[PDB]
From Swiss-Prot, chain A:
This is Fatty acid synthase subunit beta. Belongs to the fungal fatty acid synthetase subunit beta family. Coiled coil: none annotated. Fatty acid synthetase catalyzes the formation of long-chain fatty acids from acetyl-CoA, malonyl-CoA and NADPH. The beta subunit contains domains for: [acyl-carrier-protein] acetyltransferase and malonyltransferase, S-acyl fatty acid synthase thioesterase, enoyl-[acyl-carrier-protein] reductase, and 3-hydroxypalmitoyl-[acyl-carrier-protein] dehydratase. Present with 91800 molecules/cell in log phase SD medium. Transmembrane segments: none annotated. [Alpha(6)beta(6)] hexamers of two multifunctional subunits (alpha and beta).
């Protein structure tokens, strides 16, 4: 680990993850129902730390789209955030992965997708990595 | 470690980050912030000459071409030629700079004042009417 300062003099903890995300190497993981709230996700993003909007409190692409639009409206220009999805419920993935792909195609500031409660198979992970077009893929191995 | 109530997440995360910063500064930088390396902007790094002329061909590697165009020093040129996405009004879209400067036969890029970021100019020429 190393310290690095940008032009403004903001001291970052230079790390691999920090170097990739352009932010401190500290993130708020997807938490049902804590990060479900768009307000908390937007507040963490404004604070300048990575956060995952949890899908566990969302059951339809419409509800997720409304929450993501709320996050986008509340955050500043150029900000970004991730989305956390649960792998144990196939319905969650079935409605969420096409939504993430559509929002990324629209250009939404979805930095990353995290998969918790299971690691996808190789084919599914390749499908996510290729189709979704995110900056990085989070996986929570047990 | 969950004792204080209603402490804003900004405060909590800044506390953790500042703790890490001060401890790293004491251990690996000797309490001196002047020893911290300085860059224009911090981010976009994948985990994996004042006057220059570059010529693209069918066989050139896109990554090497873009790295050469960006240069070593961290600056707006670095961001222009290596940043994958640019920020719209509130959206993220593919970097127009990279897609415009995508290497192809006949493309010639002349970089002048590469050392000086403020005065740096990148002129790209292609065969037009021969």
């Amino acid at each position: 680990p190393k310290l690095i300062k940008n032009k403004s003099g903001k001291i970052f903890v230079e790390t691999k993850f920090s170097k990739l995300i352009g932010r401190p190497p500290l993130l708020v993981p997807g938490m049902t129902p804590c990060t479900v709230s768009p307000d908390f996700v937007a507040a963490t993003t404004n604070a300048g730390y990575t956060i995952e909007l949890a899908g566990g409190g969302y059951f339809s692409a419409a509800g997720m789209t409304a929450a993501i639009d709320s996050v986008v409206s509340q955050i500043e220009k150029g900000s970004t955030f991730g989305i956390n999805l649960i792998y144990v419920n196939p319905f969650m993935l079935q409605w969420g992965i096409p939504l993430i792909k559509e929002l990324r195609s629209k250009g939404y500031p979805i930095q990353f997708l995290t998969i918790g409660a299971g690691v996808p198979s190789l084919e599914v992970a390749s499908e996510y990595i290729e189709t979704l077009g995110l900056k990085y893929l989070g996986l929570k191995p047990g | 470690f969950t004792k204080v109530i209603d402490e804003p997440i900004k405060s909590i995360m800044d506390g953790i980050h500042d703790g890490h910063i001060k401890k790293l500064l004491h251990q690996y930088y000797g309490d001196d912030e002047s020893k911290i390396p300085a860059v224009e902007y911090f981010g976009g790094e994948s985990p994996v000459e004042d006057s220059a002329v570059f010529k693209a061909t069918s066989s050139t590697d896109e990554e090497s071409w873009f790295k050469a165009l960006a240069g070593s020093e961290i600056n707006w040129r670095h961001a222009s030629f290596l940043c994958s996405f640019i920020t719209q009004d509130k959206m993220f879209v593919s970097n127009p700079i990279r897609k415009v400067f995508k290497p192809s036969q006949g493309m010639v890029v002349e970089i002048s004042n590469g050392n000086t970021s403020s005065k740096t100019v990148v002129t790209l020429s292609e065969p037009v009417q021969g």
